[PDB]
Design a protein around this nucleic acid. Structure first.
Length: 278
RNA sequence: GGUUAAGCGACUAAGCGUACACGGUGGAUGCCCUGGCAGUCAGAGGCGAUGAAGGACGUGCUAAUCUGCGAUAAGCGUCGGUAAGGUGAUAUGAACCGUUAUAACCGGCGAUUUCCGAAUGGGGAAACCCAGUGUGUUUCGACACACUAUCAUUAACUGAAUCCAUAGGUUAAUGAGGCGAACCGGGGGAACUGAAACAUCUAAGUACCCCGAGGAAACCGAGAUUCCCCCAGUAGCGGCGAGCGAACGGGGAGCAGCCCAGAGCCUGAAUCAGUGUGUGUGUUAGUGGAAGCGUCUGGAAAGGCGCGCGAUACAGGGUGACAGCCCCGUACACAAAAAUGCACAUGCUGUGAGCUCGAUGAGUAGGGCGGGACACGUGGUAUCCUGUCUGAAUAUGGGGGGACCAUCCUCCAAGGCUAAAUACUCCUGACUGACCGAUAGUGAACCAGUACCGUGAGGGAAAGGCGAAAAGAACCCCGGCGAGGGGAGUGAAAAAGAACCUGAAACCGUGUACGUACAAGCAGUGGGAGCACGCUUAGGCGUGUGACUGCGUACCUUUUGUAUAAUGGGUCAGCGACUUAUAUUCUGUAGCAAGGUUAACCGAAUAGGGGAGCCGAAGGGAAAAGUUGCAGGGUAUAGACCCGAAACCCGGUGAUCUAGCCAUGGGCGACUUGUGGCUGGUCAAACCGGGAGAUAGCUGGUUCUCCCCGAAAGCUAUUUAGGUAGCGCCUCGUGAAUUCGUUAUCACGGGAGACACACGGCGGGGCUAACGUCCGUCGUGAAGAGGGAAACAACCCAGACCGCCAGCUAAGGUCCCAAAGUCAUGGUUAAGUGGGAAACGAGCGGAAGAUGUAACGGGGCUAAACCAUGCACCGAAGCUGCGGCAGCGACGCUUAUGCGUUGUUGGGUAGGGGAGCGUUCUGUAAGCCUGCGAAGGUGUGCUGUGAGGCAUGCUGGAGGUAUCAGAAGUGCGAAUGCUGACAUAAGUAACGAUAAAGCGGGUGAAAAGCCCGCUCGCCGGAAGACCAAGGGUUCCUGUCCAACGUUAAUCGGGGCAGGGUGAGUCGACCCCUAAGGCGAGGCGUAGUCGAUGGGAAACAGGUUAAUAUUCCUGUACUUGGUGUUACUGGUAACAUCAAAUCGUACCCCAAACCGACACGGUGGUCAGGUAGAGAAUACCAAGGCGCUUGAGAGAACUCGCGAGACUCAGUGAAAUUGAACUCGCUGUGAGAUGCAGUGUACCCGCGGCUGGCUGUUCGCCAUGAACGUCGUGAGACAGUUCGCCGUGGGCGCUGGAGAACUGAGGGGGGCUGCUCCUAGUACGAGAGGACCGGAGUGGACGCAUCACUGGUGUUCGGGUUGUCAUGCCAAUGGCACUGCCCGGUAGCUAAAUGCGGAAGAGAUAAGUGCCACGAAACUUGCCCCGAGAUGAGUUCUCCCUGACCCUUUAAGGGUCCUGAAGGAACGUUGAAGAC
């Protein structure tokens, strides 16, 4: 089948779409010898020979991990001011990369998923799937049980009547409380904009459970967890795509707990690494 | 001798790993095969309206299949050869026939030779249904036989528009509308590979397909034709790119050259053919046919020894082991009732010669008007075909002689024919081979054009190793009247017993010996100790096992690196990606010496004979004295080192199913059903076969072994780009001069690959401002062993051929780990300096920073460090010594290597050069070996520097091999390779589209679940039954339990046997009619056909073990013929006779059928009784029957004491993973489970591994700049936050068991607040105001809490609508969630009462004095835990008298006898309470 030229050089370990167009316009990488034109499409077949600016790159398994993004980081790559991001701890791949799913702010933590294919990263964001996820809200201010039922109905926000679904109580008698709000529409930052109407200011938003992936009880900040085969096959057939039978994860169920402990050690290590990069 | 203490020290494995012997699942290899591919010497190329090829049933004395056969049904008549046997085979028995000439089998000549398929009477579904017309007939009611869909030709007869002719119809005869290969011809017609680019071109008048025919097709000469052998990869043609592509002569004759235009004198002539008979010679079925007697070994003789016959015949195979002569086949000698072919007697019909007299081919050529095909668009344009309208000549016109004009001869237009060889191999017989032997060869060696799958078509698996002869287990024992196994018997052999000759690797077990429960994470070899079965007249000699130590960052592919969180393979066995054919060029080998070579054809078939070509023989000279094959080594081209491409084109399936529109027939209003027509940008040009075993140069992959040697990094010229000329140094061969003591240098020939650089010292280059960028060889971090810096291939050191318990260096170093001065002489001796860097100030503090120490690889080090000088040891595979300096290359002594020495020595991909084996087939080789035991497989030993070969033993019992050569499907570790046989994951997960289990009895060796019986409630106008499809014996009965079924399954929906379902009034066939079709002429009429309505009848009951409305019995109605009566052939009454075929059960609303879990779709018919307006609701009635399987316990969540989930008998999985004896942290190199160093482990499990936190946006505590969608730079979509720490069984701590203590190390016992008195205070002239110590009152539950004060509370006070119990009611109790619950005692749970963490004492940092003080983290000591703490203690009561032999006489073991204290035990036990 025929595909776009800017898409083949996207997941191969180069750039995205606008960055690839800035390279083919100067006369660097070319297909079949002649200089290709922007906006065309060719048939990708395992047999072509191209050189990325005079460098032979062999371009021909999907891996999805769960990184949790603490405070003081960015979900992008380049930054005009030079703030640290999240693409500084991902391992290197041979002819592959990682594609983030979603977008968060600085004061909004969450468990992001980094996939390899660009098609699956655009299905979970579309409202056609509607996946329910769990969040942990740590309120701090004047809040009672009378305002918990008013925000569950139609409340005017600024663009659309944003509301919640189910609000429970799981302890919280000291200085803060636990208002586990369940959401399923997605959007981008739809919890802080609803609690600022009262004394609540939303100090930190931490994501707990996403869809049906079991959260490992004992995972500190600064570190990614690669999902096994039994976990990546759930979100694959959830949309349209058939499940893949080829992977890399075997058993290592005790080797995996070794992972847990040594990795808590190495998250301490990566905090040290961020300090050093400072 | 007895007791006590200390050190060393036999004995605990339910497992895992290793070796020998003994089995099984699995059936490889060797060997064996009436079956093939491919050629030659004779032949054959058929069958085709008296019924084909390919294909269901029926047929034997018999239950069935294939071949064959057709109620005259593997048999019969006539005519021939052998008569001591047969009724085909798989595959035996039972039943018959033949014996002084009626058996069977083979060949020839006749009769006979279904429905259906080209099928002709009309439809049609290849085996469903009806025959139309005309005779005879012991059967006016029954059968058989014969003739007729067409077109064309000949003859006879008849006949319209339209007087003649012509169309149509009838009869007879001849001819044939059939199917499956190769090759040839005619009419049409493709894609892909390399094309510098492009509709130029090659591939390619091709593959495939249609019709028809044939047996094969179509300036020196000379006028049947074609093919093969030559001229010839030629003379020509093309952007003269790759390609395509002729003739004469000659070398070879396996050719044979006819008839008509013919009058006349003369015919059954000469040369020949067709149709009969007779003789002679052949082909196609048969018979006779010579030649080994015996003995030893062995159960058995085809081979051995001695003596012979035979040999025109030993071509091959079978006959108990390897066969001339024991059989079946070959020389020689004979037969003709039928048919056919090649020379010859006679006969009938025959297109017909010689001599004489004549002739040598008119609608043609050329020209004019209007088109197309010949490469050429109507060109400068030749040649080929010429409709309609026209039109010449016969040396006064035309062509040819290797084509200007001219001359002479031949030729100058419509005729009719021409064999064999050569092409082609689907069928028969004989013969042949350096082809193969069940993953080979063909899809297929047997029941392979198979089981199975799909709507049809296309395409498409596995499976014999039966034995010489079936001698294929009588009887007895166990068990279930089985399966399986053990004895006996038979046989040479029984681990070959219906998986059946020999039985490997891998996987899975038993017995013996060794190691492991304190061991170091893909650890193997070596060194060393202990122990066992055979060293052995002391000899730790060898193998397996082998605690502990030392050395070493596994292996392959892919790479600038592979020790990597970057990627690939589960293993074993079998199989697997030829360097061939056809040109040219180059090299090596060998025969006449100035004839080196022939191909095809021919030949006593490789020699002889034959020179028309290719390669050469006139050099010197710019120009005007050797070659052909085979083999080996390269390039290009039919596929050519290419596993599955994708896309496009061509040849057979494209309105069938779903969803619509116009015209609708019936049954009861946008209903439903059946048929037909119209509409192809997903059934809208899917798949398979042919092209095509095509094609993407890279990606995966150039495969077994072996000796020597061996090109590159960021580059140069510099265009036009993933490329053309070209690279010093280096290789093989040749040439080779002191050129730069075996050619290191120059030239020539052959083979024809890569390309991001980075750091440090010295020397150079933007503001040496940036520790960057830009340059050179060996050389630490990435195509060079090992050693050293803790480890390795971008500065250190070294050219590593092989053996050993040898000695001596350099770099790095010398305290221990771990072999290397605890050295000597001068300095240094309190900043953890020795364990980084800049600038500023005067060898110190030295951004002097958390590499388990408040920054060396480890423990340390206050000099045990560093610099300089002098003196030792240790230091690889270098130098040296010994042995062949194994192997290769020279000189000096030597003509086919016995050298006395020295030097280069295993870095490497691609490529190139010299010396290589094993296995299989043939000549060598009918020889030799060959039952005192072959080959292969399976062990050990010996030999060899190469892959190996030779011998012997066990198993096995039938044909095998070496030397001198040559020809290939040729040595296997991976391509997710393909086939077959097998693990871990795991004896675990799972028990599902949801009515409910349990109790009793009977059968059986075994009954949780199957069968049978009783009561209430889940199913129940449908989870029911009866019709129409699909299926065509799944429904009844009996026996059996291997396979089939999600467990069991004595049941059954499984197999076998028995048992097929009564039809003129059960359903309607045939025929007629409507819509919709077909319809000879013409381009829909006349007809032929086509129904769920109209079309004679029966509504009901009884009788089955299984299926009925039918037979028996009772009653009713109608349509023909015949006989009688009545009325005038028809009608009525009575009686008698006849009336075909097909379908038929179970299933039919989800079980028996179609998607594996009714993870749904599913036409149509019947709405009973009571109540109600109706089809809701009410009596959930009757009938069919009541999830496909159990027992305890009964969280959170969910549904309403129950129903699920989790843990358990039995049965019973997949994905992933190269393989396991699954150890942290720091550090190194782009996030280390596996290397090195330190701390810590008996095996199998479960629970821990950013709310414990923050008084309110900020701080603390570490268990239009992006990331993705697609889009022909066209922009939108939506979318952007902008093993360790702990807890349980079975064990151990020195034979063993039940307690109480001492308590190493860590989280835990050291965490918080207010008031009053001391105290308007110490110090101070005032104000503000102490510190320490003591008491009391608050948070958090530190263990709690029952006298009193609360709450909760399924066995007791105490009620209540209805119902139930005590006989009924009341008075008392219990059930529908604990029906709503109203109160309380004891045990448990708590917001209140008592006690209780800030101590007493000792030791620190910071801070404060001149030893004295010293905090919430540390320590005897105030809660609590703890001896798996391997370093492992003491006391204390106890527990603790059975013996005889063998032997190497000792920490020993076995048999007979015995079973203690304590612990362990689960039918005699639930106020103990989720588990």
């Amino acid at each position: 089948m025929s595909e776009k030229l800017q898409k083949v050089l996207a997941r191969a370990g180069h750039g995205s779409r606008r960055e690839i167009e800035s390279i083919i316009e100067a006369g660097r990488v070319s297909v079949d010898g002649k200089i290709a034109k922007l906006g065309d499409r060719v048939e990708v077949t395992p047999g072509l020979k191209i050189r990325i600016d005079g460098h032979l790159i062999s371009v021909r398994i999907c891996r999805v991990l769960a990184y949790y993004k603490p405070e003081g980081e960015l979900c992008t790559r380049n930054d005009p001011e030079g703030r640290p991001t999240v693409f500084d701890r991902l391992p290197k791949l041979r002819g592959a990369r990682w594609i983030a799913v979603g977008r968060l702010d600085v004061n909004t933590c969450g468990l992001l998923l980094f996939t390899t294919d660009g098609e699956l990263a655009n299905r979970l964001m579309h409202p056609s799937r509607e996946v329910e996820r769990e969040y942990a809200v740590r309120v701090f201010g004047q809040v009672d049980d009378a305002k918990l039922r008013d925000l569950s109905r139609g409340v005017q926000l600024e663009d659309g009547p944003a509301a919640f679904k189910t609000i429970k109580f799981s302890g919280g008698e000291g200085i803060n409380q636990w208002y586990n709000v369940t959401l399923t529409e997605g959007r981008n930052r739809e919890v802080r904009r609803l609690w600022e109407a009262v004394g609540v200011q939303v100090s930190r938003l931490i994501r707990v459970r996403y869809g049906d992936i079991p959260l490992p009880k004992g995972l500190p900040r600064g570190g990614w967890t690669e999902l096994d085969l039994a976990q990546t096959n759930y979100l694959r057939e959830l949309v349209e795509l058939p499940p893949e039978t080829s992977s890399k994860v075997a058993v290592e169920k005790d080797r995996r707990r070794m992972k847990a402990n040594q990795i808590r050690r190495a998250v301490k290590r990566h905090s040290q690494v961020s300090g050093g990069r400072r």
